């Protein structure tokens, strides 16, 4: 059974019925007063989404182009909040624990995942430090109680190859002990010259039921990326416009192949302990330890040379980082009635502790011709080293009551967080050290009509430690998010279809801002994001499945000291939409065959915060064809062909500023063979 900390419910095709993302306890999506999306394993496989970030491309309120084609980190911009977008990811109910002030952000390979859940808007009441756009919760594959065996292989353009396995089953005749073991090896050249991606990973899991009341699940996840793909950008000047009659190529590499390394090792161990005390009382402990090593060498472009016409100026970043992090969450839940009201009352204590030891290097590199570059001039003039030890501790105590009474579904939550952040500059010996407390709250009310229509309203809050520091090196006050949301969900009690609309108004306060003059930031900035999201899952008779989305987002610097007050953040489309369909033939000659595809639309974006130049809009097309060869008498064998960006559009995905613009992925074609046995 076991509601606490579990999604439960069911999924069919692309549609899940329940989640725990918004509540830390299984709750129908239809009866949850927040916007929640779920991306199923089937959707991930059918769209050939090769990373978490790419899996989100059909979900509303999410921009998946922050660094264009790069696959090194998962950047999920939610409701237009791009800053600290690498810190939006949770895994098995626990913050991933990367350090967004360093190069040590972790990445979870999609092959380990059963599903991806997305919660929109401020959500600190259950999770503590987090961003005002929302957060993403990955659920890993868990042990199965019947023998399961899959082997999978892929080949594609851009030198892509991948082999994986996924084995699961009971170890004892009683089916009380079950294992899963998943492994993978993959590689790609990318679109970019001289670049490699490569990964090897293994994830063992063991689940043991001590009785009907207790389950312990033991988890390991070991991942080695000896190469890190591409993570660079070039000027707007020759991408969004010609530069002396030319455009920089979408395959251009601005670095030095002899001095281009990204080596990331992620070692995780953890456990989940689920204990039913009573039909009333349940308790759960989720734990994860993380230890990672990252080594980086990168020569990158930064603007055009003032003396040499078609050459880009370049610089060098170098890093050796070691991250350690502990995270535990302790939950105790009472479910009980008091006359006509049912209460699901949760109390929790969570604890995060992170240390990141970083040795950073930087310098000046030789200039490079942006067309016809000549590689090999890799000498760096180094600038002064910059070594730090960065520490974070967060303790949270939280309370939530889900109250169902008649057709009303109410949610009430409060959390107190004690946060301590320290940054020891090991080069200079000086130490910044700060401590503070924050209280966050949430209130939701939803009315469930018996035809399956559910209007709701939610008020919800968030906070996050400020990435900036003041006139004394001491970090500014944490940023804060506050959101009003009004929504409507619909599922007809018949259907395997689900439809939602959400309207939102988010304010983020204490954002760092400064006059151009000054060197010190103050926490007087404010950002406002408001808009509309529409999501539709329409599934007809187990052979035609559709998903579609529309997003309207109006985000603005409502208070800024730097000249940009009233401007729109860059990397924030006002309009996005998407539509994906998949058709399976089930009888007749063609049976076993499936055809699918979709289109994604991203509206215009500002290339810069000064709002002087637009990144054009783009529409991308995806397609798939699958065949179950079991129909020719080889059960468990199937093949598929995918093409993302089928028309091979060559475009700029977004820009961070006028200096750094990113190309979108070219056409990506993969062929896959899956063997069950
Ligand atoms: C956490 C990773 C653990 C990997 C486990 C190795 C694979 C399982 C070992 O073989 C299994 O032994 C059992 C009898 O003892 C049988 O039930 C089963 O039929 C048989 O195939
Ligand atoms: C669990 C079993 C794993 C099996 C391994 C599958 C293939 C892994 C591909 O790795 C590497 O890709 C690089 C980048 O393109 C190439 O430079 C290199 O030549 C190649 O060796
Ligand atoms: C303000 C108090 C904060 C809430 C405390 C939450 C306690 C939950 C601790 O974990 C659970 O507790 C059980 C104890 O019975 C054990 O089975 C096991 O440790 C785990 O399952
Ligand atoms: C609650 C028990 C968790 C302690 C061990 C892992 C915590 C994650 C960060 O590790 C760091 O390890 C250093 C060891 O030299 C110490 O400075 C200190 O422990 C901590 O800053
Ligand atoms: C062997 C590793 C697994 C251990 C399981 C940890 C038990 C859960 C209680 O967490 C504790 O919460 C406190 C908040 O008051 C922190 O101050 C303290 O440091 C932290 O440890
Ligand atoms: C059972 C959970 C209780 C909290 C556990 C953490 C140890 C006590 C925290 O003391 C300190 O108090 C300061 C102001 O008084 C806060 O601003 C700051 O964050 C914190 O360092
Ligand atoms: C954000 C919206 C606020 C909703 C207002 C609170 C509704 C309380 C739940 O009870 C409802 O209303 C009557 C109140 O007396 C009851 O008689 C009856 O049980 C039920 O119909
Ligand atoms: C295509 C556009 C779809 C619009 C989607 C948003 C619908 C939000 C409804 O929320 C409800 O609003 C009513 C009036 O306030 C009240 O019943 C209550 O306040 C609140 O529960
Ligand atoms: C538009 C989507 C539906 C939600 C509507 C709820 C009311 C929105 C207004 O919110 C408030 O507006 C003021 C603007 O300065 C401030 O009081 C504060 O910053 C903010 O909290
Ligand atoms: C479904 C397709 C409809 C497309 C209509 C084109 C409008 C594109 C909107 O760009 C936005 O225009 C605002 C001023 O109008 C700027 O504030 C905002 O800064 C900017 O991002
Ligand atoms: C499935 C999404 C299809 C939407 C494509 C929008 C076309 C371009 C409108 O031009 C904007 O002015
Ligand atoms: C649902 C399946 C749709 C199949 C897509 C048809 C287009 C096939 C052509 O693509 C190109 O093939 C080259 C090698 O032939 C690659 O090197 C190149 O990089 C790739 O762009
Ligand atoms: Na929400
Ligand atoms: Na990689």
Residue numbers in the entry: 144 to 820
Question: What did the authors write?
Answer:
Here, we determined several crystal structures of FoxA from P. aeruginosa, in the apo state as well as in complex with the siderophore ferrioxamine B and TonB. Our results indicate that the transporter can exist in several different conformations, and that both substrate- and TonB-binding is required to form a translocation-competent state of the FoxA transporter in a two-step TonB-binding mechanism necessary for transport function.
As we have demonstrated, the full engagement of TonB by FoxA is dependent on the presence of ferrioxamine B. To understand how FoxA interacts with its substrate ferrioxamine B, we co-crystallised and determined the structure of FoxA with ferrioxamine B in absence of TonBCt and compared this structure with apo FoxA as well as the ternary complex. Our ferrioxamine B–bound structures of FoxA revealed a common siderophore binding mode similar to other TBDTs. The electron density for the bound ferrioxamine B in both structures allowed us to unambiguously model the conformation of the ligand as judged by the Polder omit maps. Several hydrogen bonds are observed between Tyr805 and FoaBO23, Tyr218 and FoaBN12, and His374 and FoaBO22. The His374 residue, located on the 3rd extracellular loop, faces the octahedrally-coordinated Fe(III) and allows the imidazole side chain to form a hydrogen bond with the hydroxamate groups of the siderophore. One of the water molecules involved in the coordination is stabilized through hydrogen bonds by Gln441. Our crystal structures of apo FoxA and the ferrioxamine B-bound states revealed only minor conformational perturbations of the extracellular loops and the periplasmic side of the plug domain in FoxA upon binding with the siderophore. Titration of ferrioxamine B to FoxA purified in nonyl glucopyranoside lead to concentration-dependent quenching of Trp fluorescence and allowed us to calculate the dissociation constant (Kd) of 100 ± 10 nM, with a 1:1 stoichiometry.
